[PDB]
Design an enzyme around this catalytic site. Structure first.
Site, short mmCIF file in Angstrom:
data_model
loop_
_atom_site.label_atom_id
_atom_site.label_comp_id
_atom_site.label_asym_id
_atom_site.label_seq_id
_atom_site.Cartn_x
_atom_site.Cartn_y
_atom_site.Cartn_z
N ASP A 322 10.30 89.37 36.76
CA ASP A 322 11.21 90.17 37.57
C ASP A 322 12.16 91.00 36.72
O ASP A 322 13.26 91.33 37.16
CB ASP A 322 11.99 89.27 38.52
CG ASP A 322 11.11 88.60 39.53
OD1 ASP A 322 10.41 89.30 40.28
OD2 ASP A 322 11.12 87.35 39.58
N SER A 347 15.81 95.47 35.70
CA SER A 347 15.99 94.24 36.47
C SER A 347 15.76 94.60 37.94
O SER A 347 16.59 95.29 38.54
CB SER A 347 17.37 93.66 36.25
OG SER A 347 17.55 92.47 36.99
N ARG A 348 14.65 94.13 38.50
CA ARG A 348 14.30 94.52 39.87
C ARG A 348 15.35 94.04 40.86
O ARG A 348 15.63 94.71 41.86
CB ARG A 348 12.94 93.97 40.25
CG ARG A 348 11.78 94.62 39.54
CD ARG A 348 10.65 93.63 39.33
NE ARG A 348 9.37 94.28 39.07
CZ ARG A 348 9.08 94.93 37.95
NH1 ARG A 348 9.97 95.05 36.98
NH2 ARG A 348 7.89 95.47 37.81
N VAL A 349 15.95 92.88 40.60
CA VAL A 349 17.02 92.39 41.46
C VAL A 349 18.21 93.35 41.40
O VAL A 349 18.62 93.93 42.41
CB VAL A 349 17.43 90.97 41.05
CG1 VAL A 349 18.64 90.53 41.83
CG2 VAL A 349 16.28 90.01 41.25
N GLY A 350 18.76 93.54 40.21
CA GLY A 350 19.75 94.59 40.02
C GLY A 350 21.10 94.20 40.57
O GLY A 350 21.60 93.11 40.29
#
Ligand SMILES: Nc1ncnc2c1ncn2[C@@H]1O[C@H](COP(=O)(O)OP(=O)(O)OP(=O)(O)O)[C@@H](O)[C@H]1O
Ligand SMILES: Nc1ncnc2c1ncn2[C@@H]1O[C@H](COP(=O)(O)OP(=O)(O)O)[C@@H](O)[C@H]1O
Ligand SMILES: Nc1ncnc2c1ncn2[C@@H]1O[C@H](COP(=O)(O)OP(=O)(O)O)[C@@H](O)[C@H]1O
Ligand SMILES: [Mg+2]
Ligand SMILES: [Mg+2]
Ligand SMILES: [Mg+2]
Lengths: 487, 51, 479, 475
Positions: A322, A347-350
């Site tokens: 991720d 960072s896909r979450v971010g």
């Protein structure tokens, strides 16, 4: 039942007998050595040994225990250094743990999960700002040799002692697990020393599968660590597990598979390397409020060669994570330490894994750094530029000099917020770049001396109201007045 | 006038240096090509003889 | 039912011995005496009444001589409107924790493709609300679509946007198949589908559930699962869709994430099944195993299946055998790039690698065709001027070339747009741009009407009017 | 127990025992043979059959010859009696000075020290070399690697370290030659007899008295089979482990080249019936190396400093052998051919070279800052190589030109004439202390040496020599 050894070689045995063996169970020889059955062929059985093969003698009796390979779990591991199988090597006492857990297990499904919303304070500035990490995330630390990966992970471990000491709620504490595959015992001892010197072992454990240790231990150590962390994950206690380096595990698996006469694939690896790392990293998760609400963050580490991420193992582990924290040698020697390339790193979450107080500053910082990276090459040549372009260059250089950090010198979140506020609102543009390295330090001491209330307010409310904004601005003005720099 | 003369000379030298670099890179490219072919073929053969 | 005995176990490959009445290939076998359900799919006949099978779940805990039962048929998945609003595994078992599937029918996932005599339909145009897609690579209503790209380019986001912009408006049903993707993504998709009415779960006092409505069906074979599952989950979802196509006759939407994983799964076991590897480690049965799938996805004279496949392209290499073979199986293509995403131009579609069979003057008129081709010509011209700019500089370019560069940059920035699902990255709201507006805006930009307008204005704007509004705001803020 | 040879394949011998088998790693002696052929067991194969690797040539063996099990692995003598004496892998001396009258013998194969029995105390060494003392400080009691291809100066560097360390050590030392030229072995033996490191004395009755020696020697060279090359480093490690265990004294171990040890496995595993790995190497390429390196470690009893020369085939650092070896080292020194073609010697690439003992908590902040400034300068110069090659220096700005000047100057300044090179260089050696190096680097970085030429820094040591050479060059 019992069986007899038929062939022995290179830490692998071929048995005759034991028709009632479970694929993957422990096996015991008549000299104390243990093994793991993998290849349940028709005539013989292929066992991998947990130690040296000098003990086995082609005729030795062998017995099955019936146990699938498992490891202990609990708080008895905290503060201890153990091998892949839970046997301690610190040299001080046994492991007081009653409940065990199977090594290879099925990851949790789609329903008992939830989105990632809590951050995992890494202690660094570039990570916590531009490449944020959450609780339940799986973020890779990929780079070349001698670039600052283990240092990033150890700083992440060290930053948690303040957060854990200032509470007794296990739901907020973050426990840590350091899995060392392929490393030499000198390095693991140095890491243990660095953690003990800072009281960062009462909440950590270590799983050392070093180079002298046989291939099966290097292959099993990360799964043992995930098993130890699943206790925290299912009990409602957050944990972070670090794998150093995973590639070493892949190499060990290749060795075992090639000595079991299994056929190879690309770069002599099997095809099951993807399954190996997917099995391992999908166990990291953020569970729901019905399953306790725990978490298991993962921070694997990978060493590339010549920065070639087009290789076979990096490509897989990039496609099953991720995020990414790339590390480069050019940036490491230019002066940027940690050598995080904020372009490739994502960072896909971010922002969901970021505090609002850090969002407010980090958005502007990311934008400014993008612009600076875009015009940095043109600027070096030297040509007339507009005031706006020059300002962009000045702010980008200031921010780049801000994100530098000493090793084993992490910082709290509120202090990062304050420093990046000073950097973003323009209190570093006229200042000399090389001077910033003290503007930071002094400013930190100042806001830890006379402005503890601002830090407490940011820690509690986790945002920047207009009141805290004005107070911080006044503090920065007082600091610049009291001090003097080259510009 | 002096500027333009120097510009022509510089373009000449740059084209020559680019040709030299092209020669070197061509050698390296052929070496890497042969290596790739040999490596892929050895992988296939080793997977074929381990049956 | 027959009865067999496990003979040996090698990873995900299991040899089984029968005393009589060998089962045909592709048949399903059930292991008896195991912790959980374990299904094996026959793959080879070796000799001496022995077969070689592929396990759907982990082989940990298996014993030689353990008993096996043939079912007399391949993996039968349930079908109907009862699968709607519900998640299912490769073997049809539910993993939504809501109860069992009360289906009155089952279909074998292994079927034969429709013949040549069952022709397709007209190339119906599909409106997605995306600009570059509707303009340069129009998607067909009844044909296959491909989303090629590496890691970190916006495939999953684009599929989610297509779901928001198509599946909700679609009157037929829809299917999703997660083939070796992350499980977090599945949880997020399920929650978003429950939110936007595509799934309608209603709990009852008696502990049961009610998925009435809920025009969607989900199937998942994620990375945690072993090979054998990742391979066959796509066939499972495709059979679930083929039911609605053939019998019901309703138009169906199929979304696959990523198809490449399905091919990878075969490689993971091929060498264990005694096959010699192919060029770069892949299996020999790559093109055939993929075509047997793809040919089942096609429009007929009873229904239609519009598929949207995301194809992982490792190391951004389009010369890899898997995408190279997949290119030939698609009607519409959309290649995403990293060099474009670095510029913040999302969706990161490369308009010079994206193509479509539909972009012809007879299907879409010449106002569309000529506009698209002029856009592509302009962008290629800008691409040819890159080296001259890098060596000499903009000073050397004539005013024609400067006009070209300006228009090309404006087009690049204009093809971008913000999605509704990307609010959690950008914070900006989403847009739905119809196609005539896109054509008007592109014609206007290419004609030279908007040369005065600044380049920055054409950023994340649904329409040209929005660009004008942004330019007005930027000019007012300038003084 | 007696056994029979059933099969012979080059450097591999499959033997058949009737009553009882020998364990693995056990030594076997062939009787009907001219020399003392020793066989090390490697595998068991069933039918009471055993597979073995030969420590000498198999020319002359017969299917039917008799073999005797010694009951224990290979045994090498240990003590102060091995000092000043050459010994092959099986302990037999090849110095032509008599037998080794040592009391105790250790096994070639020993388990490494445990985790608890380690002591990572940071120290430093005085090599006298500018580049390693500045940018890659060597760790007292740790492992050191010299990576390079062919013809870049590994052997000369090891000889310089011997002259500048071992003579000024006081403690003991060991040298293992693993697939190197026999010529340089004889050269080292005579240089050691010269410098007093080996003190040989011939008694009246032909005997010898090596009392006073401070260095042992173990040589398994190119004129040896693979089995006699994959077991020499273990012999040397036993000889050094005896010192740092019972004697409890610091020792220096020098290995030339370690890569040969892996290479032998490459030309053996094919015959042992193993599937090859990526580049024909073994699947056991990492464990066979880690089991060798983990025996080298400072402990609470003593310490082994190690200096290993690691070959790099075809100048490819991505090869599995050096790639694996990088993980086991505490300090690194990567030699380059591109830098040797410029006449710079030692041809150390200061960017690929690194170390763990460079942090400011070990060395001062002035040392750390000077090193990091030098690295930044050289990287900034490397970043302009393409645009200089294509376009030229004229395109660059003035800051970049100053950078290029200082980078060329500091490259040429990190070049030292050694004492052992006098035979093919003529210029005398220059030992250089660390503070002089740091002052010189500080001055070159500040800009207090821009007036000087570029060829005045070539092979001068300190700065006073540079200024004197600039004076003489003004003429
Ligand atoms: N923020 C930092 N500032 C200064 N030096 C750093 C920093 N981070 C790491 N380093 C230095 O980088 C060097 C390598 O440290 P590290 O243990 O992280 O290596 P690595 O990246 O894990 O690679 P490997 O373990 O394979 O050698 C050390 O000398 C360390 O002092
Ligand atoms: N339209 C978009 N807008 C902004 N960011 C995007 C967009 N699409 C992708 N990204 C960024 O790239 C990442 C790609 O994740 P994902 O959508 O799963 O693509 P893929 O599966 O191809 O790697 C996102 O997390 C996001 O950071
Ligand atoms: N300091 C040096 N000064 C001059 N010549 C050197 C120096 N170092 C190496 N050389 C030359 O390079 C060659 C290297 O050979 P050698 O010392 O055996 O290194 P290697 O073991 O890497 O082959 C020598 O013949 C020598 O002529
Ligand atoms: Mg490390
Ligand atoms: Mg995706
Ligand atoms: Mg040499």
């Amino acid at each position: 039942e019992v069986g007899r050894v038929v062939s022995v070689g290179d830490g692998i045995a071929r048995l005759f007998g034991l028709e009632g063996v479970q694929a993957g169970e422990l096996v015991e020889f008549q000299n104390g050595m243990t093994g793991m059955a993998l290849n349940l062929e028709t005539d013989n059985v292929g066992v991998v040994i947990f130690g040296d093969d000098r003990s086995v003698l082609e005729g030795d009796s062998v017995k099955r225990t019936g146990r699938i390979v498992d490891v202990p779990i609990g708080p008895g591991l905290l503060g201890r250094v153990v091998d892949a199988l839970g046997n301690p090597i610190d040299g001080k006492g046994p492991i007081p743990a009653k409940e065990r857990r199977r090594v290879e297990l099925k990851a949790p499904g789609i329903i008992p999960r939830k989105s990632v919303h809590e951050p995992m304070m890494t202690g660094l500035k570039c990570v916590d700002a531009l490449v944020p990490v959450g609780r339940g995330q799986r973020e890779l630390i990929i780079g070349d040799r001698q670039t600052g990966k283990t240092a990033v992970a150890v700083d992440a471990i060290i930053n948690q002692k303040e957060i854990n000491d200032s509470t007794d709620d296990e739901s907020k504490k973050l426990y840590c697990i350091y899995v060392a595959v392929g490393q030499k015992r000198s390095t693991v001892a140095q890491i243990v020393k660095a953690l003990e010197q800072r009281d960062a072992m009462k909440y950590t454990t270590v799983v050392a599968a070093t180079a002298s240790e046989a291939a099966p231990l290097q292959f099993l150590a990360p799964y043992s660590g995930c098993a130890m962390g699943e206790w925290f994950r299912d009990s409602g206690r957050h944990c972070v597990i670090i794998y150093d380096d995973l590639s070493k595990q892949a190499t060990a698996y290749r060795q075992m598979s090639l000595l079991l006469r299994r056929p190879p694939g690309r770069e002599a690896y099997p095809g099951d390397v993807f399954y190996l790392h997917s099995r391992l990293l999908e166990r990291a998760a953020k569970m729901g409020d019905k399953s306790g609400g725990g978490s298991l963050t993962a921070l694997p580490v990978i060493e590339t060669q010549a920065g070639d991420v087009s290789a076979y193992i990096p490509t897989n582990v990039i496609s099953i994570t991720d995020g990414q924290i790339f590390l480069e040698t050019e940036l490491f020697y230019k002066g940027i330490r940690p050598a995080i390339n904020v372009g490739l790193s994502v960072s896909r979450v971010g922002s969901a894994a970021q505090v609002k107080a850090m969002k407010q500053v980090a958005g502007t910082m990311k934008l400014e750094l993008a612009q600076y990276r875009e015009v940095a090459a043109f600027a070096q040549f030297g040509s007339d530029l507009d005031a706006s372009t020059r300002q962009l260059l000045t702010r980008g250089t200031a921010l780049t000099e801000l994100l530098k950090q000493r090793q084993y010198s992490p910082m709290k979140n509120s202090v990062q917020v304050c420093v990046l506020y000073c950097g973003v609102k323009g209190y570093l543009d006229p200042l000399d770049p090389k001077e910033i390295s003290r503007f930071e330090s002094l400013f930190i001491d100042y806001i830890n001396a006379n402005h503890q209330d601002i830090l407490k307010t940011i820690e509690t409310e986790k945002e920047l109201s207009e009141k805290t904004e004005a107070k911080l601005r006044a503090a920065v003005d007082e600091f610049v007045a009291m001090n003097e720099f080259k510009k | 006038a002096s500027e333009q003369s120097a510009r022509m000379s510089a373009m000449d030298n740059a084209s020559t240096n680019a040709g030299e670099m092209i020669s070197s890179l061509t050698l390296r490219y052929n070496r890497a090509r042969q290596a790739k072919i040999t490596t892929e073929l050895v992988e296939i053969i080793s997977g074929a003889n381990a049956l | 039912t027959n009865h067999g005995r496990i003979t040996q176990v090698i990873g995900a490959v299991v040899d089984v011995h029968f005393d009589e009445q060998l089962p045909p290939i592709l048949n399903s076998l059930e292991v008896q005496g195991h912790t959980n359900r374990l299904v094996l799919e026959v793959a080879q006949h070796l000799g001496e009444n022995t077969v070689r099978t592929i396990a759907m779940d982990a082989t940990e805990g298996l014993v030689r001589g353990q008993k096996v039962v043939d079912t007399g048929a391949p993996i039968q998945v349930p079908v109907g409107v009862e699968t709607l609003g519900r998640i299912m595994n490769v073997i049809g078992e539910p993993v939504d924790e809501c109860g069992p599937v009360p289906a009155k029918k089952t279909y074998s996932i292994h079927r034969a493709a429709p013949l040549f005599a069952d022709q397709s339909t007209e190339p119906g145009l599909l409106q997605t609300g995306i600009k570059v897609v509707d303009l340069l690579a129009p998607y067909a209503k009844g044909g296959k679509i491909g989303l090629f790209g590496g890691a970190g380019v916006g495939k999953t986001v684009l599929i989610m946007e297509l779901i928001n912009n198509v599946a909700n408006k679609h009157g037929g049903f829809s299917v999703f198949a997660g083939v070796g993707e992350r499980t977090r993504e599945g949880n997020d998709l399920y929650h978003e589908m429950m939110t936007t009415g595509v799934i309608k779960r209603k709990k009852l006092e008696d502990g049961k559930f009610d998925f009435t409505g809920s025009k969607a069906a989900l199937v998942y074979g994620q990375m945690n699962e072993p090979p054998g599952a990742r391979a066959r989950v796509a066939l499972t979802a495709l059979s679930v869709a083929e039911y609605f196509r053939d019998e019901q006759g309703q138009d169906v939407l199929l979304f696959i994430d990523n198809i490449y994983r399905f091919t990878q799964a075969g490689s993971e076991v091929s060498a264990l099944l005694g096959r010699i590897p192919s060029a770069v480690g892949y299996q020999p049965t790559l093109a055939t195993d993929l075509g047997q799938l793809q040919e089942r996805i096609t429009t007929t004279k009873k229904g239609s299946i519009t598929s949207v496949q995301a194809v992982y392209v490792p190391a951004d290499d389009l010369t890899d055998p898997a995408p190279a073979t997949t290119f030939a199986h698609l009607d519409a293509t959309t290649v995403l790039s990293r060099q474009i995403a670095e510029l913040g131009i999302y969706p990161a579609v490369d308009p010079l690698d994206s193509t479509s069979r539909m972009l012809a003057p007879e299907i879409v008129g010449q106002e569309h065709y000529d506009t698209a081709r002029a856009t592509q010509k302009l962008l290629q011209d800008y691409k040819s001027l890159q080296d001259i700019i890098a060596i000499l500089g903009m000073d050397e370019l004539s005013e024609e070339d400067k006009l070209v560069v300006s228009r090309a940059r404006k087009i690049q920035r204009f093809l971008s747009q913000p999605f509704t699902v990307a609010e959690v990255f950008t914070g900006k709201p989403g847009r739905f741009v119809e196609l005539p507006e896109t054509i008007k805006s592109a014609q206007t930009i290419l004609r030279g009407e908007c040369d005065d307008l600044p380049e920055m204005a054409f950023y994340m704007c649904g329409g040209l009017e929005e660009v004008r509004s942004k330019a007005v705001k930027m000019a007012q803020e300038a003084a």
